């Protein structure tokens, strides 16, 4: 070990450092960045294969900006719809946004399972996971509210009338006096305040 190490030391001392040209591995701190690189390249490749022969292929990174905008709209549960965008380009953007979303949700689930297991002591990882599940829960909550608007009140009118009638008969059987509005002449306003 030490002779290999000192040979490497003397090699850097007497023939220099081969700093540039080697392939770095994708460690954890690089994963997301690497993902972005690959995804952008894939999208870019598809664009070059959907352009007809003769179209002006200079402003095609505009589509990569549209992809960034669509991902930002997905994270905020805002419906992304660019008027005048061509249909194959919109299809490419939707397809790769859903792939990125699948990767993002899978990573969020994996990190939550690690946090529950006690296998993670990183604080930024935990705060990232809380943010991701906050966004996922708000997307689910928006879908629930929209579904309640569409599909009506799930409690049927007979069920609500039965619940209301049961409450009326109970509160009549208990001789309950309804709580009045707080009067101006209430002698207990100050202590409650």
């Amino acid at each position: 070990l030490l002779e290999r190490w000192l040979g490497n030391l003397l090699s850097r001392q007497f023939e220099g450092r081969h700093s540039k040209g080697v392939a770095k591995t994708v460690t954890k701190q690089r994963v997301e960045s690497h993902f972005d690189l690959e995804l952008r390249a894939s999208v870019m490749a598809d664009l070059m294969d959907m352009m007809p022969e003769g179209i002006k292929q200079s402003k095609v990174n505009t589509v990569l900006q549209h992809l960034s905008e669509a991902w930002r709209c997905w994270k905020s549960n805002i419906p992304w719809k660019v008027p005048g965008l061509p249909a194959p380009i919109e299809n490419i953007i939707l397809r790769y946004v859903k792939a990125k979303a699948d990767w993002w949700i899978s990573v969020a689930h994996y990190n939550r399972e690690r946090i529950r297991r006690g296998a993670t002591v990183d604080k930024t990882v935990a705060k990232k996971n809380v943010g991701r599940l906050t966004r996922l829960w708000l997307k689910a909550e928006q879908e629930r509210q929209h579904n309640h608007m569409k599909d009506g009140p799930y409690v049927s009118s007979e069920e609500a009338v039965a619940i209301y009638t049961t409450t009326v008969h109970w509160l009549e059987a208990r001789k309950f006096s309804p709580i009045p509005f707080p009067s101006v002449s209430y002698k207990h306003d100050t202590k409650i305040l």
Binding site: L2, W5, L9
Partner: protein
């Protein structure tokens, strides 16, 4: 003598290696000098052996 020659080839003459193999700065080091003079595990392991 090998450790001293390696130190002097790297122009780290503000580091003194004494005869009991202790590497000490002879003066107060700047940030750039501290970053240049930071040896690794091979040098230090060999020095301690």
């Amino acid at each position: 003598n090998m450790l001293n020659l390696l130190i002097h080839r790297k122009n780290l003459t503000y580091l003194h290696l004494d005869y009991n193999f202790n590497l000490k700065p002879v003066k107060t080091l700047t940030t750039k000098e501290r970053k240049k003079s930071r040896f690794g595990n091979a040098f230090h392991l060999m020095r301690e052996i």
